[PDB]
Design an enzyme around this catalytic site. Structure first.
Site, mmCIF file in Angstrom:
data_model
loop_
_atom_site.group_PDB
_atom_site.id
_atom_site.type_symbol
_atom_site.label_atom_id
_atom_site.label_comp_id
_atom_site.label_asym_id
_atom_site.label_seq_id
_atom_site.Cartn_x
_atom_site.Cartn_y
_atom_site.Cartn_z
ATOM 1 N N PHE A 227 37.709 43.079 43.644
ATOM 2 C CA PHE A 227 37.683 41.965 42.698
ATOM 3 C C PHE A 227 36.276 41.385 42.495
ATOM 4 C CE2 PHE A 227 42.018 42.045 44.481
ATOM 5 C CZ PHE A 227 42.739 42.202 43.311
ATOM 6 N N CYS B 206 36.434 38.183 40.354
ATOM 7 C CA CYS B 206 37.595 38.090 39.483
ATOM 8 C C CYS B 206 38.259 36.726 39.587
ATOM 9 C CB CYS B 206 38.616 39.168 39.837
ATOM 10 S SG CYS B 206 40.012 39.233 38.703
ATOM 11 N N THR C 113 43.605 46.865 34.417
ATOM 12 C CA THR C 113 43.324 46.856 35.852
ATOM 13 C C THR C 113 44.596 46.639 36.671
ATOM 14 O OG1 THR C 113 42.727 44.505 35.683
ATOM 15 C CG2 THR C 113 40.918 46.099 35.712
HETATM 16 C C1 HEM Z 1 44.048 44.857 39.708
HETATM 17 C C2 HEM Z 1 43.664 43.827 38.954
HETATM 18 C C3 HEM Z 1 42.258 43.415 38.717
HETATM 19 C C4 HEM Z 1 41.077 43.949 39.178
HETATM 20 C C5 HEM Z 1 40.911 45.146 40.085
HETATM 21 C C6 HEM Z 1 40.019 43.163 38.629
HETATM 22 C C7 HEM Z 1 38.656 43.385 38.891
HETATM 23 C C8 HEM Z 1 37.625 42.559 38.455
HETATM 24 C C9 HEM Z 1 36.270 42.741 38.805
HETATM 25 C C10 HEM Z 1 35.730 43.838 39.697
HETATM 26 C C11 HEM Z 1 35.558 41.751 38.206
HETATM 27 C C12 HEM Z 1 34.062 41.542 38.293
HETATM 28 C C13 HEM Z 1 33.414 42.216 37.077
HETATM 29 C C14 HEM Z 1 31.913 42.342 37.189
HETATM 30 O O1 HEM Z 1 31.276 41.847 38.151
HETATM 31 O O2 HEM Z 1 31.296 42.953 36.287
HETATM 32 C C15 HEM Z 1 36.475 40.953 37.486
HETATM 33 C C16 HEM Z 1 36.132 39.875 36.725
HETATM 34 C C17 HEM Z 1 37.089 39.194 35.998
HETATM 35 N N1 HEM Z 1 38.427 39.410 35.940
HETATM 36 FE FE1 HEM Z 1 39.427 40.752 36.850
HETATM 37 N N2 HEM Z 1 40.537 42.193 37.881
HETATM 38 C C18 HEM Z 1 41.870 42.262 37.865
HETATM 39 C C19 HEM Z 1 42.789 41.442 37.196
HETATM 40 C C20 HEM Z 1 42.458 40.377 36.351
HETATM 41 C C21 HEM Z 1 43.379 39.568 35.651
HETATM 42 C C22 HEM Z 1 44.891 39.697 35.701
HETATM 43 C C23 HEM Z 1 42.634 38.648 34.913
HETATM 44 C C24 HEM Z 1 43.089 37.558 34.016
HETATM 45 C C25 HEM Z 1 44.359 37.248 33.776
HETATM 46 C C26 HEM Z 1 41.259 38.919 35.184
HETATM 47 C C27 HEM Z 1 40.200 38.234 34.668
HETATM 48 C C28 HEM Z 1 38.894 38.476 35.078
HETATM 49 C C29 HEM Z 1 37.811 37.618 34.575
HETATM 50 C C30 HEM Z 1 37.908 36.465 33.604
HETATM 51 C C31 HEM Z 1 36.686 38.067 35.143
HETATM 52 C C32 HEM Z 1 35.297 37.505 34.933
HETATM 53 C C33 HEM Z 1 34.957 36.537 36.069
HETATM 54 C C34 HEM Z 1 33.688 35.765 35.771
HETATM 55 O O3 HEM Z 1 32.611 36.374 35.584
HETATM 56 O O4 HEM Z 1 33.699 34.514 35.720
HETATM 57 N N3 HEM Z 1 41.183 39.972 36.042
HETATM 58 N N4 HEM Z 1 37.732 41.467 37.625
#
Ligand code: HEM
Ligand code: HEM
Ligand code: W06
Ligand code: W06
Lengths: 453, 453
Positions: free
Chosen positions: B391, B398, B266
């Site tokens: 996010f 996120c 991502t």
């Molecule tokens: C451009 C960068 C990023 C985008 C666009 C992005 C996007 C997202 C999105 C849309 C979700 C929600 C997923 C859902 O509802 O099914 C999410 C969840 C998450 N992202 Fe990212 N993300 C990015 C970077 C990161 C990074 C760098 C990390 C960790 C180092 C990360 C860790 C997570 C985690 C752990 C979740 C789960 C949150 C939860 O349910 O507690 N993400 N992300």
């Protein structure tokens, strides 16, 4: 009457003895059995291998003997051309290139290349700093990366970026494959077999790869007309004081290819063998490590500091004594002459000098010739003339000696400063032979001393 | 009169529409034709795709809707386990890990990671500065090298050393092969065919490589007791305020795998799209470049300088508007509820939020929704609720948002400072779809502005 001679194979005579992947080591074993000189015949070809200082000092008489192109060098000539390494002394282009290039390879000229040698040296150190706990170092592979990039960067301001790759730069891939092909032709004796037609196809592809790239950069440099701290600049602006002529573009390309062939694996081997002997002799490692820590007080080593690394230089010479990475060179008799007061030679008769045996001559070094003791080179003047020849002889000696020694001393010094090394596999010495010698499969674990760069 | 629906395929209904390499882009096309909302049917399953801010703002109501595990995430759960990304809100381990990890992913915890982000960022910069003339940059590949190493280093102090490789680390190779494998299962006639037996065998091995490595490092860290400033230390020492319990070793493993999966692609995707838009909009690039030169006045960027990169932050958001690299998420109805005063839903009924369409809602953004204007985010407060959701939403948003934006802003800031970029091939946008989106084959040339480090 009869000069010693190894076992024969009918009509092929001694030729099948070189049908093995370790010819030099097999010749050393024959030299131990047969002594200071033995004859070696093949169909329509004869040579004589010299192992003793007393005969080799005569062989090194330039009025009597001149550099010969061994069959190996003749095959390397197909891509190295009439560069310094694969040209005859009597060819116009040898002396011409020799006069132009000698100032560019002098000890004082190393001050110019130093900065770019450090650039690659630092990349090596940073790679090793960034390894994880239980990971190890493939020594000759990384040494080869460093030497290729250093000569590439110092020679014609080109970055192979070997530390960014696993599969090397196309040029490097083509070069090693060309070298291998050249050395493999010594073993076989059926030139035009339909199976080997594939080998000749790849060879001509590899020649073109090397030529196209080098010619590209030569032209790019002339068109842009930029100045740099490299051999290409000196080769474009340089004139031979004797003939008044500069090198033409075709020869310039052959010199560039030559510097890579002649220098890269010889130097990488020296460092590989040096580090091997260091980890196999812990007391010697402590000494060298102590010197490195004392002298290299700056994060960026200076030219002046490298010169102070006396014991590191002794370590390298002793490594070169035991395993000279360019283990042999060939000579021919300029006129009819008698060798040692008992071996008559005709005009054109070829001599091979087994350097590893020269360096094991009991009458010079003592009884303990197999032991690793840098103390032997405590005093340079103490060593008798023509007893230690890792860089060859006279006017056909290694032009890149000060380059090689400055690189190996800088890099080994930086290695011993920044890391503690561990022979974690209790590595058993296995010497792989191409044109040069290297310790195959030699691995170590480096633990960092946490010193900044 | 009833809910719009795309073309059907008899008994298979809409399912064959997702049988394509670019399913999200096809869904976006369907959304243009049908509009705000459409039903999507398959054998024994149904969902509804939402594209407008009007309906999506209701969908983001956590009292009526919660995160659903889409079929994609269910397949990722086979190696991501009950980590934050693939766990249900009602699972005990989600809330524990959420409370434990939030402090470590705050905007203020980024001060601790900053130094390690710069470490990897400097490697990227030096790689590009060491490229020769007429060499080019493979953009998403180098960004993926950066994002993997950065999260590896910041997450559990492990160096994948991606810039020393053409062939990635065994872990990342196994992880991508597992993600690819898991994503292909969405379109498969029936998974128990003998043809996939090798894929299933390979899938189980990919899981083992990731588990073995992560478990070992957890154990190495556990026995050593070394106090790093990474996510692993906080998971070994952290206790959930509510339950009072820490994470057990098995969940910690899944969390590390999750940060590597959820973060790396991502973030690299974002950087790849941002640079793409900049080279396609040269006036916007100059604005960003001017800000980079003005703000980043030191060789090593500081945390506080990265916060001042305002326009670069706007560039990243506008790239996220047009191509949010995590392009969709799934929700389910907590109870029977009416959506938009028109479409009635039952308990458990699923919704898909098509984020690229939301971000092209003309009623929110105006007519020019396809054009790249960072100036839209000049005043963040003016954007209505739930209009911009790259996010995700709510407590299941996120957790790594601040990490990803800090990294992207730092890396892009440095990129714009040190290099002028050339769209030398006139790259035609081609968006490859995995779990995420990226501009496949995007290449550029970087000319160094020659500013030292
Ligand atoms: C451009 C960068 C990023 C985008 C666009 C992005 C996007 C997202 C999105 C849309 C979700 C929600 C997923 C859902 O509802 O099914 C999410 C969840 C998450 N992202 Fe990212 N993300 C990015 C970077 C990161 C990074 C760098 C990390 C960790 C180092 C990360 C860790 C997570 C985690 C752990 C979740 C789960 C949150 C939860 O349910 O507690 N993400 N992300
Ligand atoms: C450990 C490092 C090295 C060793 C042991 C070594 C050894 C030798 C030897 C034994 C020869 C004589 C070959 C013969 O008589 O047929 C030679 C020639 C040569 N070496 Fe090296 N060498 C080393 C490094 C280098 C480097 C780094 C360069 C260039 C950058 C270089 C360039 C040459 C050239 C040009 C010749 C041909 C000299 C001439 O005939 O004019 N060598 N080297
Ligand atoms: O190329 C040559 O002329 C000689 C020996 C030889 C090779 N073919 C022969 C035929 C007849 C008589 C002798 C030979 N070659 C070698 O001694 C060798 F073993 F290949 C060598 F040692 F490896 C070597 F070729 F000399 C060398 F060390 F690689 C080289 F670098 F060329 F000096
Ligand atoms: O996994 C799902 O449930 C839904 C749609 C879907 C997949 N299989 C289905 C079978 C019947 C009905 C619907 C579906 N998947 C998608 O919309 C998708 F596009 F394929 C997707 F790639 F998984 C995606 F959801 F867009 C996504 F971007 F990958 C995800 F990250 F999961 F949001």
């Amino acid at each position: 009457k009869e000069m010693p001679q190894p076992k024969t194979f009918g009509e092929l005579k001694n030729l099948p003895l070189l049908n093995t992947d370790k010819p030099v080591q097999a010749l050393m074993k024959i030299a131990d059995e047969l002594g200071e000189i033995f004859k070696f015949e093949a169909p329509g070809r004869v040579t004589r291998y010299l192992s003793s200082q007393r005969l080799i000092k005569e062989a090194c008489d330039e009025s009597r003997f001149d550099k010969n192109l061994s069959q190996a060098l003749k095959f390397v000539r197909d891509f190295a051309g009439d560069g310094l390494f694969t040209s005859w002394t009597h060819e116009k282009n040898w002396k011409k290139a020799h006069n132009i290039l000698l100032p560019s390879f002098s000890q004082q000229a190393m001050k110019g290349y130093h900065a770019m040698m450090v650039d690659i040296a630092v990349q090596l150190v940073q790679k090793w700093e960034r390894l994880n706990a239980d990971e190890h170092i493939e020594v000759p592979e990384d040494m080869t990366r460093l030497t290729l990039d250093t000569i590439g960067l110092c020679g014609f301001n080109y970055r192979f970026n070997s530390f960014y790759r696993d599969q090397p730069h196309p040029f490097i891939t083509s070069m090693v494959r060309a070298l291998d092909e050249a050395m493999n032709k010594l073993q076989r004796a059926n030139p035009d077999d339909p199976a080997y037609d594939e080998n000749k196809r790849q060879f001509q592809e590899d020649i073109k790869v090397m030529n196209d790239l080098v010619d590209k950069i030569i032209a790019d440099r002339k068109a842009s007309g930029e100045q740099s701290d490299d051999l290409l600049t000196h080769m474009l602006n340089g004139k031979d004081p004797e003939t008044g002529e500069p090198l033409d573009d075709e020869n310039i390309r052959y010199q560039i290819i030559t510097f890579l062939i002649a220098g890269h694996e010889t130097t990488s081997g020296l460092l590989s063998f040096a580090l091997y002997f260091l980890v196999k002799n812990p007391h010697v490692l402590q000494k060298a490590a102590e010197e490195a820590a004392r002298v290299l007080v700056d994060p960026v080593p200076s030219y002046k500091q490298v010169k102070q690394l006396k014991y590191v230089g002794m370590v390298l010479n002793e490594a070169l004594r035991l395993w000279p990475t360019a283990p042999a060179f060939s000579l021919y008799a300029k006129e009819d002459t008698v060798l040692g007061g008992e071996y008559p030679l005709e005009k054109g008769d070829e001599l091979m000098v087994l350097i590893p045996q020269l360096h094991r001559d009991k009458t010079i070094w003592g009884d303990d010739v197999e032991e690793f003791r840098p103390e032997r080179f405590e005093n340079p003047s103490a060593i008798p003339q023509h007893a230690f020849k890792p860089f060859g002889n006279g006017q056909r000696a290694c032009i890149g000696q000060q380059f090689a020694l400055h690189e190996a001393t800088l890099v080994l010094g930086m290695m011993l400063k920044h890391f503690d090394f561990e022979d974690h596999t209790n590595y058993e010495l296995d010497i792989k032979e191409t044109l040069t010698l290297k310790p195959e499969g030699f691995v170590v674990k480096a633990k960092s001393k946490k010193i900044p760069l």
